[PDB]
């Protein structure tokens, strides 16, 4: 798979792992998978029963806020875009995309 860039991210598959503006990030592989996912599909709302499967190999039950968190997670380890937009939007109950620089 392609290397992708957002803003200063940098995500490489081949050695799953994510930098920014030259700094290797201290993320898990699950955390990779989901950047990168969503990064695919920059701007466009992926569902939360994709993201359930494609990172974390379940069903999404209602009850299962597991994505939620990643993204919680990573909202705190990612340094703020130089660009000023946010990396994430939620879209209730559609999902969550990657947000698109302007
Ligand atoms: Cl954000």
Redesign the pocket.
Known sequence: SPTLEVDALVLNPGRQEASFDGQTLELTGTEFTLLYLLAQHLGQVVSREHLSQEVLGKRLTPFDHAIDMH?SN??RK?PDRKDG?????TLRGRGYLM?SAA
């Open positions: 993204i990573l909202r990612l937009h946010p990396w994430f939007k947000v």
